[PDB]
Design a protein around this ligand. Sequence first.
Ligand SMILES: OC[C@H]1O[C@@H](O[C@H]2[C@H](O)[C@@H](O)[C@H](O[C@H]3[C@H](O)[C@@H](O)[C@H](O)O[C@@H]3CO)O[C@@H]2CO)[C@H](O)[C@@H](O)[C@@H]1O
Ligand SMILES: [Ca+2]
Ligand SMILES: [Ca+2]
Length: 167
Amino acid sequence: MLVANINGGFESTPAGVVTDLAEGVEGWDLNVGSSVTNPPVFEVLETSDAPEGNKVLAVTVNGVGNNPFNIQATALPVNVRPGVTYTYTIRARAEQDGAVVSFTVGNQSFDEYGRLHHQQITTEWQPFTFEFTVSDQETVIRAPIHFGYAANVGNTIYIDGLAIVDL
Ligand SMILES: OC[C@H]1O[C@@H](O[C@H]2[C@H](O)[C@@H](O)[C@H](O[C@H]3[C@H](O)[C@@H](O)[C@H](O)O[C@@H]3CO)O[C@@H]2CO)[C@H](O)[C@@H](O)[C@@H]1O
Ligand SMILES: [Ca+2]
Ligand SMILES: [Ca+2]
């Protein structure tokens, strides 16, 4: 497969809790804003029900901040070509009912090309997909996933298999 993003299924990362948020996970940048006073736990988990490979990323939300982007996992770099249309696909599920996530893609200037907004995440793995076009002259973009929704407090959201593919 040809994908724009790196380590989209976390298979390069050792299992364990991630505390180097910017660089602990190849291909991703994790962020927690300081308004989040009960910080989340980001963990790469080895599990037999990983949709891809043997590992997933688990995000346990113990609290939230002021905006959903105050807890994020962002794929970066994401290598693309100006004017090309891409398919985004990812897999997600949650430990408990009632989780919400937005899956977005944007450039280094934080201009957003597209998103799937307040997706309802269930306890079963589901694919989440949308198309976007690189409508400017950027070649290296990013794919922020927002987890900091109040409804997620006390839940764990699992993601795997991000693939951004030249349509
Ligand atoms: O690339 C990782 C960095 O992300 C920074 O947060 C950005 C979010 O990832 C992005 O979703 C958000 O996008 C804004 C957009 O700029 C605005 O036009 C639109 O109206 O709202 C979107 C969000 O709902 O931009 C922010 C940056 O302001 C982090 O701040 C950072 O820690 C991280 O490295
Ligand atoms: Ca995986
Ligand atoms: Ca990084």
